[PDB]
Every structure is written in structure tokens, then in C-alpha cells.
Design a binder for this molecule. Structure first.
Ligand code: COA
Ligand code: COA
Ligand code: COA
Ligand code: MG
Ligand code: MG
Ligand code: MG
Ligand code: MG
Ligand code: MG
Ligand code: MG
Lengths: 245, 245, 245, 250, 250, 250
């Protein structure tokens, strides 16, 4: 089975019957695709395509990335699953695939990151630049993002060159994972597993946010945060202990 | 009479004489249009059009919404009037129509909201997604927005599924009307009449901001705000009493 | 010599050999151009072009601006130099030219500002509107920006009509240079030389930020800031003395 | 229940478009945006043609808005386009649907594009008219001077390579194939292109040259070069053309 | 090292495309996206053709995905397109490369577009088929009815102005020039367009009209009008056409 | 006040474009971006042609930048394009303005596109050249081999269906109509296409086939098939062509 894919295809078929004028959109992006992988790469290439660099070139490059990284099949699905499990506003597997710029931005970064590591720096920067303009997510291609990442609303996200985000993290819009100013080498946050980072929060410097911690909306976080705590405020203070899942 | 429309047409004619290369823009969007309604729907369809879903399809759908909601004629004009009366930076009725993504985003939501209520969920999400990418306004289609809404600068606005904004409200860029985390059902703010919400403010949870209240730039608002007060800070505190108009 | 230009051409040639599919991008924008000026105006016109107003019309208008302002040759280069000297994340003169929406937004404003002063108000607003949508930078065309301006990440920048930014300033994303509310005439900040303004900061009213001062990420600045100090917090407080360069 | 509520051409086209969408849903954007969302056949035809001619140089929208202006000034276009559609339906065995010319056949799209251009030209909007002529020549391969006069119930079958000069006149119920020139001898000044009478068929690749008349109900065989006026009710063939027989109308 | 690993046509095309890019790097986006990034000649041809026919009305993507469906259902298309490419290579002195038809020659693009349309038409997808016919008529200037039957090793040289009727049959190894009509007399109902046998050459501007046969290995001189069946192994010329001599194949 | 400051063609075009905009302001984007914002006629012509040929496959910009390179290497193009414009103005009654070929007439756009392609081909940039030939065939319906040689003061009237072979030569002051082939007999190897001398007029649909010469000032009637060299100062007509009379130049 591939239950995420089969659900997505059933939803697209229903969506098309319900609203025929969207048939070109839904067949080109889901129903004529032979796999979820090709559906996701297609949508993102179409959103990022421009006269400067066609959707085709983007999609063909994405194909080469998938070929080199079969593990992306798994990561992709855990990422879709993170949306489904963590966002009450949408009730379909199809929604992140078609609609959610946060989800698109994560996979775009995975592409840009892979290119950057191949020494295809320009392609990597081009995708960073286009993602920054169209998804409003400025993620440096050398950043490292884990799987099961949930990028909710996303607008205004900034992630620096040396930032690391571990698995099962949720990140709101307006979040900066950035540097302080005395910044040469390793200068951006390391975000551990199961963290939630609320809207507008700034996490600055080579500091750590410990496992399962929550950063309240609007915090400015300048010192490392221990595991299992809630921080809030400008500057941030521990305001509680917290759990995971 | 229709003084907003007649002023807009006189401005466009003058603008065209003054700068002929913009004649195609100004005739296609204003001067060849038989009404303000068709001018507004045209501009917004053109800004939102994409290979995925043409400007035409968007404009035709907008036409069906107007046909089903003749009250939008009135709402549209009070919305234009809110810009004219509340923003010193522009002195023309034409400016919101042509230029102001906040104004475009409000009417886009009105379209998406109507579609959502018709059971055209995908179209609704598609427009939410496109508005989030192009206008940087992420408004859930189930949100409810009153008339005489002023969306100034707009970039980064987020409005949740169960948020309600009442009439004659002004909202700056960077504003979140969102949820806290213990969020099942009704979980997003209710904004009463005549409120001003300043840049970067986050209003979180199923809480109310009372009539004529002001939220200072950068506030994190976690508790309901009574009528006629100014709140400021992280977290927000009452810092004064205030009036309307 | 023109060492910035010659370095940019050598980088583009190398980039093209390294990744041939980007040859159309890199030749159209750099290598077939006879000057850095024409390269910069071309990239920005291509990013801002739309069915509403073609990249060609934008580029031709840009040409007229350069012809009227030969000083832009110098300003452009000091602006590129500000990126090179102040951002560790990129190591090429070519990077701002091709990729950095902040850099594109600054020159876009310089164009819009010049048009505004010519009485080509609509063109000016059109470019403000398009820059606000594509670069997420909302800069009123009557704003005044000095040279050696560094707009890092840029997303969500708002600059009001009467704001003045002097030379050698660095500005992060999420920054508002805006008004308080009792705002008739001169109502927006004046930013002096060598200032750094951190992510998310709001500077509100006709107040001054003195030379070489630093505004920490997330500050709400409501009172004028003296020279050579660091301010932080909501509301902002002096937290230190600081220097320039 | 006024007489103009009778419109079997539009209703069949709406039914055919919906059935097409069910059977091939990927075509739904095309068929809804061009037919099913339109409140009239006039608006569907204007939209189709506008989209075919649309270019970064002059948008489909500007073309469609200009078409709207033409219809408002020329109400008879509603009947003319219906008779032109009926011509295809009656005269071409290769297509079974009223929808076929509306969506597909560049001859039908060229005819209405000329009607638009012709109106614009008479209004003193000569650049708009030449622009349409230019775009029609490039996309429909039909180079029709905007001063040319074309009747109704015109069937432009296949159409590729059609040239019609400035002073040509084509009357009602004519059928014209691809590769046809209604042109000049090259040796006169004013009135200098052909006058085609009602009911004429002009075969593929025919050149008709000069201020000459093709008489009513006559037929021009494929590849004829026609240099002298043709009487009514004959077939001509050959290079140059000669009467090869007698013919009737309908 | 199965037999179908032998593919000198694809390998030469890959080499020619890479050499072209080195020599003229601004063409790198075109040549990589159309040839060098593709894992097969089939995918390059589908991509090229999809991009040429693509329009806001129906995207290149939808066309390319539909092409993919045709290849999956018609595996023989892999050999057919290779023989069609080999026809150009063998029969046109003006071009030296297998890559020339794949990228440039609208006759070759039209042939495969017809193959797609023909398959769709037989599947009951008649709107898709007419849409392709319509788009091919406008962009390649080749108006080929989707019910027409076209053999392999077809060379459509220059192509502009080609018209092929609904009941036409063209067999293998035919060469057809621009301005050619395989059409009707206008006076019959069912089977009514030409049957072209193997090895035939049809010269520029020829009209072949009626349910008539052009016999094997025969040649139709430029500008001929052909109204009667042509026996094998002759050349015909003239208006109307007459046997002017004897001819062999190859 | 050097001699090359005299440019009545450019100045009339600038005046005509501005007057057009006042009269029909919706055309302002087109006319300003193509004429009024340009600092030279060369730049207007390059821009117009680049925009017509532009495609996602190779942008108008790349085409315009490549045109710029051609002009820089071939300064005589400034005079050639002006004589080509003057040819239309002098030879076509249907248009009254120097601006008409620059904006509208695909024959004029094809000629300059060939000039670009021809230069590229001689530079070893054969893919670029074939790409332009391919795009011109599809958008202007003029299939001109880049190795063909075309003189100045060429008038390509209507143009649809033009085919010119690899070894064709056309000298100065020629007028050529639509449906014209300067092609091959199909039976030779090297030099194999026509040599057209100065002052020739070639009528619509004419096929001129072989390494044959059309003598100076001669005229080819519409629909002629020309298989033998034509002496100077005659008119030929027919299938095949025969001398039908005597003719002079101008
Ligand atoms: C001429 C036409 C109208 C019908 O012909 P008709 O009036 O029935 O005449 P007939 O077929 O009886 O032919 C009588 C004579 O005319 C000649 N003739 C007919 N069509 C001719 C043509 N196109 N060119 C030259 N001669 C022709 C015949 O050779 C015959 O000569 P003959 O008696 O010396 O042997 C038809 O054949 C034609 O060419 N029309 C155009 C159809 C077309 O373009 N279709 C394309 C479909 S895509
Ligand atoms: C007919 C053709 C196939 C070769 O001819 P062929 O079989 O060698 O015959 P010949 O050249 O020996 O000519 C013999 C007779 O036929 C005539 N003839 C040849 N081609 C003719 C044509 N197109 N039209 C009319 N008559 C023709 C000759 O005039 C000659 O008549 P005559 O003996 O009374 O003087 C060739 O000339 C042709 O026209 N084919 C099409 C090629 C084409 O379209 N090329 C375009 C390249 S872009
Ligand atoms: C031939 C042409 C140049 C002028 O002809 P001309 O030199 O003045 O010769 P005349 O008109 O005096 O005709 C003399 C003989 O030639 C014949 N003739 C002329 N043009 C002919 C043609 N196209 N085909 C066949 N025969 C032709 C006449 O029938 C006449 O024969 P006859 O004496 O046996 O009756 C002109 O008619 C022509 O066809 N040129 C092309 C114009 C064109 O293509 N225009 C299209 C405008 S869009
Ligand atoms: Mg449009
Ligand atoms: Mg004949
Ligand atoms: Mg595509
Ligand atoms: Mg012949
Ligand atoms: Mg361009
Ligand atoms: Mg003749």
C-alpha cells in the first residue's frame, strides 16, 4: 500500500467532479502523475518556475535529486504526515501537497541543499532566492533540516547558514534562526527534536533549544534553552516545564 | 452618481496622458471597464493569475460571486473609503484599486470565503494559497471579515479559521490573529468594531479585543481586551483609555 | 579597471561551465551585458516584469533613470560592496546582483523614487506595489535612502513616506520604519549613518536613531536614540555604548 | 419567450462542452473558461479568439474588451457569427458539432478577427486594425486587409495561406479553401481586387487576380489562376482558368 | 547488451546537443531541458513537441503527460519516430544531424502530433484530438484530420500549408512537401480522400483530390493537380496531371 | 550635422507612433516599448522581431541581445533595413507608412530574421541559426535556409508559405509574394536552388526549381512552375512557365 498517495488521488478525483474548472490543475499535478514524489516535485516546480529558469528545468533537477536520494520518499511522507497530525485547519493529505507554501519550502530547501553539496552553488542560491520571493522563506542552502518538519503559515522565516533543525520540529511564521553579530563561523541556532517555535520568535546565535521545548510567540531567545521547558518574552525566560508528542 | 467610480476614471485618464506607456495597464484595468466592480475583480484576477489557474478563470469565478452577493457593491466601496480616510500616504480612490495588496487581499478573502461556503473548498484553498504567496496575507477562508476593513502594508498577516473581525477595523502588517496551542474548536481571536491593530502584534486564542481598542505595535495579546483601551507590551498591558472614529 | 564588474563576469563564466542548464540565465543577465549597470537593471526588470507591465518597459524606464542619474554608477557599486563586506553567507560580488531581493529592492526604490520626483506617480506606485509583492519590501517612493545600504533577508520591511535613511546603514528583515498614529506631516524615522537595525525591530514616529547606533532584534523604538549606543527591548532601552565600521 | 430566446446553436454548444469535460476532465479549464462559464455564445467566441491572438505585445484582455466594444456597436454580429457557424456545420463533413468552429477552426476565428479589424479600421483605429491583421496572418495564416469586405455565412475551410486584398469584396454564402489569393495583377492603382458574388466556391490554391468578378454560384477548381471575370453558374479550372462546365447553387 | 540497447540515433543526438552547448552556451537551457536532461529520445521528442504546442489554453505539461500515455499504450512509437528521424537524415541534404528534425523541423513535429491526435481520436477523446489538430494547424501550418492514417518513415519537408483529409491514407516511406493537399473533390460523402502508396514523393504545392490512389514509387511534380488514380512507377506533372515518364523506387 | 544625422525614415516612424498612441491609448505599451522608448530604428526593429520570435524555449531577450551582436559586427545592416523598409513603402499600395513594415509585416520581420540567422550560421553558430529558421518558419511561415543569400531592398509581400533553399541567391531590389518556392528539382547534390537577379518580381504561388537563373527585371506570373533559366526583361507564366512577353525594370 501507499495510503497517503491513494488518499490524495481519491481526494483529487472528488475535487475535480465537484469543481470541473480546476480539472486542468488537479490532473496535471496529481491525477496524471504516477507517484506522490512526482506530484510533489511537479507542484513545487510549477510554483517556482519563471522565465529566468523554467518549471521544466526545476522539475528535471528535482528528478535527479530524488534519484540520488531515495530516502526522500520516506522523508516526504513523514513531512506530509506532520501537517496532517499537527494542523487542525485542513483535513486532507492533499492540502500540503497542493497549497501549503511551508511544506513546499521545506522540500525546496532539501533540493537547494543537495545542489549546494554537489557544488551547484548557483542553482542552490537561485532556488533560495526564488523560495524567499515566492514562499517568503529565506533558508540558506547549507542549513540542515530534519524530517517531520512542520512549517505552519511560514511567511518571513529566515534560517542561517549554520542552523541545524532536528526531527519532528514545528515552526511558525515570522521565525528567525539567525546570528547575533560577533558572527564568523558557527553562528546560528541548533534546534533539537520535538521543539515548537511560535510566531515571530527570534532565536539568535550559536545556541541550542533543547528537546521538546516550546518557544512562545514573540520571544527573543539569546541563551540556550534546556530540554522540556517553555520560554517566553523579550528577552526569553523559562515560564514552565513541558512535554513532547 | 457613483462618485468613487467617476473619480477613479478621471484619475486613470489623467495618469494615462501623463505616462502613455502605462496606457495598456490603465485601460485594461480601469478605463475599458463598465464598473468599479469589474475593475476591482479584474486587477485582483490579474495579480493572482498563474499557469496553474488563469486570471480568466479567477475573474469568471469572481463574477459569479458578485452575482450571488450584490451587497459586495456596497462593501467594496466602504472598503475603498476606509483606505482614503485612514491612510495619509496616498490621495486617490484609484490607489487601493490598482496598488494596495492589503485591499486586494481583503476582496480575495471575500471570494475565497464565499467559495468555501459553497463547498468549493479547493478553489478556496487555492486562492488562500495564492494570496499567501503573492500578497503575503494568509487568511483561512472560513475566517469572517467585516466591511470598512483597512489592511495597511499587509505583509505577514495571518488569520486563523475561527477568527472574526468586525466592521471598521484597521490592521497593520505582521499581525497574527491565531491560536495558543490547546486549540480544538473555536480557537482564534474575535476583533470588535473600530479596533486598530498595530504592526507585528500577535493576538492569540479565543479571546476578544473590545470595541475601539488599540493594540500597540509588537504586543503579544493573550487575554481579552476591554473596550476603549490601548494595550502594549510582551505580554500586553492596558496603558490607557482611548476613543473611536 | 572596474574590478566589481570583471569579477562578476569571471564568476558567471565559471558558474556556466559548472552548470550548463543555467547558461541562458547567466548569459542573458550577465555575460551578454556590456556593463554592471545593465546587468543590474536587467535582473531587476526580469524579477519585476508581469503581464501588467513588461520587463521591457521596466528596463527601458530604468535606462532613462540611469541616463538622468550617472551618480547611480557609483551608488550601485558601494551598495554591492556593502553586501560583500557585511554578509558572511555569500562570497561573491555576483550574489547580490543575481539573488538578493534586498539588494534588488534598494535599486527598485531608487527607480520608483526618481519616477515619483518626475511626477510619474503611477509608475512609482506600481513599482512600490510590485516590490512589496515580489521582494516583500514596502518602501514608499518618497522615502530617502542613502548609499552603502545593506538590506539583509529583507522580508517584511516597511518604510514610510517621510522616512530618511542615511549612508552605510544595515537593515534586517521584519523592520518597520513607520508612524505612531498622531501622524500628519513628517511622521517617520530618520536613520543616521552607520546604524544597524536588527530583525523585527519597529521604529515609530518622527524620531532619530543616532549615528553608529544598534537596534537589537525585536525592539520597539518610540523615542529618539542617541549616537553610539545599543538599544534593546519592548519598549527599547539603552543597554550599552557601541562603535562604527 | 421573445423570439430571440430561441438559440439552438448556443444550447447545443453548451451541452457538447459539458459532455466533453466529463469524458476528458483535464480539458475542464479550457472548456469551462471558454464555453461553460460564459453567459453567451458571443462572449465564448470573443474569448476563444482573444486567447488565440493574445501576446505579451497586446493582451488577450485588451483584445476581448475591444471585441466587446465591436459587438455593442454592431449588434448584427450576433446573427452573422451564428450564420458563419451554421455554414461550417452545413458545408464540412469532417466535423459534427456547432462547437467545432467555435473552439478549433482557424478559418472561423480569422473571419471574426477580420470583422473586428474592419470595424476598427472604419473608426480611424488603423493601428489596432493592422495589429489584428498582422496577428491573424501569423497565427491563423490568413492575411486579410482590414478594408476588405466579407459577407456572412462565409466558410473558410482549412484557411492556411489565404490572402485578401484591400479592395476585395466577398458576398454572402461563399466557401473559400486554403492557399487562396483574392489579389491584384500588380498593374493597377485603385479598385484592384476581386468581387466574389453569393454562393461561390473557391477551391484550394486558386489565385483570383484583378478587379474582376466571380459570378453568382460559380465554382473555382483547385489550383486555377483566374484573370478574367467569371459568369454566373459555371465551373472554371486551369492555368489560366477556362469554363469547364455549368453549375447550380445550394 | 540486449538488442534494444543499440540506439545510435539517440547517442548521436546526445553528443550533438552537448557539443552545441559548449560552442553556444546561451542555448544551454534549451538543449539541456530538451535533450541532455532527458533519459530517452522518446522523452526529448515529447518534450520538444509539448513545448511548441503549449499555450495558456492547454499547458505543455498536459500535452507531455498525454504523449506519455500514448507511448505507454503504443510501444511501436519508439521505432516509428526513429524511422521518421532516419527519413529526414536520408532524404534531406540541407541538414546533417539526427538532432535537426528533433529540435527544428516542424514537419517532423507535426507527424508525431498527428500520431498523438489519431490515438486520442480512436480512444473517443475527440476534443483532445481536435485541439491538437487545431494547434498543429496554427503552429506547424499542417492541418491533418485526426482520422487520417499516416505510415512510418514519413518525410514532411518544409510542411507549410499541408492539408490531409479525414479519410486519407498515407503508407510507409513517403515524402511530402509544403503546399500539399490530400483532399476531396467536394462532391462525395464517405471515403473521399487519397490513398498514397509506399515510396511516393509528392512535390511542392501539389493537390491530390478524391478517393484516388497514387501508386507505389510514383512521383508528383511540383504544382500538379491530380484528379485520377496514378499507376505505380511513373512521374506525373501538370494541371491537370499527366504521366510525363517512368520512375523507380529508393 | 554629419550626413548620417539625416534619417527621415526613423523620424517619420517616431511621429507616426506617437500620433497612433494619442488616438488609441490602449496601444501605448506596445508603441512606446517598441518605438518611442527606443533610441534608434535598429533597436526598434530588433525589439519588434525579438518579441515576435520570443518563446519560453529561447527568450526575446536572448534573441534581442544576439541581434545587437549582429548589428555591431555588421554595420551595413542599418542601411539594409532602411532600404528594405523603403521597398515596402515604394512597392505596396495597401500601406501608407514607414512604420507599417516595422510593426506589422511578417515578410519584413522574416527578412531581418534571416539576416541574423545567416550571420550566425557563418560564425559556426549553426544551432542558433537553425533555431531562428525554425521559429521563423512557425511564426512568419517563411522557411528560409540560413545559407541562403538575400540582397537588400527585398520586398516579401504577404510572405506566407515562402520556402528558400540552402543554395538560393536573391540579389537586390527583388519582390517576392506568398506561396513562393525557390527550391530544388530533387535530383541534384551541390548547387541546386535558384539564382534570382536584380529587379525581379515573383508572383504568388510560383515554384522556381533547380540551379536556374531568373534574369534581371523579369517577372514570374502567379502560379508559374519554372524549370528552365529565364532571360532578362521578360514575363513568364504557366505550368510549366513560358515567355508570355517583354518587360522593363522600375
Ligand atoms: C472543378 C471541381 C469544382 C469539380 O469539377 P467539375 O465541375 O465536376 O468538372 P469535371 O470533374 O467533370 O471535369 C471536367 C473537365 O475539367 C477538368 N478539371 C476539373 N477540375 C480541375 C482542376 N482542379 N484543374 C484542372 N482541370 C480540372 C477535368 O480534367 C476535365 O477535363 P477533360 O474533360 O478535358 O478531361 C473540383 O474538382 C475542384 O477542383 N474543386 C476544388 C475542391 C477543393 O479544392 N477541395 C480540397 C479539399 S481539402
Ligand atoms: C517532375 C519532377 C519529379 C522531376 O521530373 P522528371 O520526371 O525528371 O521529368 P523531366 O524533368 O525529364 O521533364 C519531362 C517533361 O515533364 C515536364 N515537367 C517536369 N516537371 C514539371 C512540373 N512541375 N510541372 C509541369 N511540367 C513538368 C517537363 O516540362 C517536360 O516536358 P516537355 O518534355 O514537354 O518539355 C520534379 O521536377 C518536380 O517537380 N518534383 C517536385 C520537387 C519539389 O517539389 N521540390 C521543391 C524543393 S523545396
Ligand atoms: C503575369 C503578370 C506579371 C502580368 O501579365 P502580363 O505580362 O501583363 O501579360 P498579359 O496579362 O498581357 O497576358 C498575356 C498572356 O499571358 C497569360 N497570363 C498572364 N498571367 C498569367 C498567369 N498567372 N498564369 C497563366 N497565364 C497567364 C494570359 O492568359 C495571356 O495569354 P493569351 O494571350 O493566350 O490569352 C501578372 O498577371 C501576374 O500573374 N503576376 C503576379 C501578381 C501576383 O502574384 N499578385 C498577387 C497580389 S496579392
Ligand atoms: Mg489574460
Ligand atoms: Mg485548375
Ligand atoms: Mg510547463
Ligand atoms: Mg505540375
Ligand atoms: Mg523579455
Ligand atoms: Mg502562371
Amino acid at each position: 500500500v501507499d495510503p497517503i498517495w491513494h488518499s490524495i488521488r481519491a481526494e483529487a478525483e472528488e475535487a475535480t467532479r465537484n469543481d470541473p474548472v480546476l480539472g486542468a490543475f488537479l490532473y496535471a499535478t496529481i491525477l496524471n502523475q504516477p507517484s506522490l514524489e512526482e506530484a510533489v516535485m511537479h507542484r513545487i516546480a510549477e510554483r517556482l518556475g519563471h522565465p529566468d529558469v523554467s518549471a521544466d528545468i526545476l522539475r528535471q533537477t528535482f528528478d535527479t535529486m530524488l534519484e540520488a536520494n531515495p530516502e526522500w520518499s520516506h522523508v516526504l511522507r513523514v513531512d506530509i504526515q506532520a501537517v496532517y497530525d499537527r494542523d487542525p485547519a485542513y483535513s486532507r493529505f492533499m492540502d500540503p501537497v497542493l497549497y501549503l507554501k511551508g511544506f513546499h519550502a521545506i522540500q525546496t530547501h532539501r533540493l537547494a541543499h543537495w545542489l549546494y553539496k554537489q557544488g551547484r552553488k548557483d542553482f542552490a542560491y537561485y532556488l533560495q532566492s526564488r523560495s524567499s520571493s515566492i514562499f517568503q522563506t529565506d533558508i540558506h542552502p547549507a542549513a540542515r533540516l530534519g524530517s517531520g518538519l512542520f512549517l505552519d503559515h511560514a511567511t518571513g522565516l529566515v534560517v542561517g547558514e549554520t542552523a541545524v533543525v532536528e526531527d519532528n520540529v514545528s515552526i511558525l511564521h515570522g521565525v528567525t534562526l539567525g546570528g547575533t553579530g560577533k558572527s564568523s563561523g558557527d553562528r546560528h541556532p541548533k534546534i533539537r527534536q520535538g521543539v515548537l517555535i511560535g510566531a515571530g520568535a527570534k532565536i539568535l546565535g550559536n545556541i541550542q533549544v533543547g528537546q521538546c521545548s516550546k518557544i512562545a510567540a514573540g520571544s527573543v531567545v539569546l541563551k540556550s534553552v534546556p530540554h522540556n521547558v517553555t520560554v517566553a518574552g523579550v528577552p526569553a525566560r523559562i515560564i514552565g516545564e513541558t512535554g513532547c508528542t
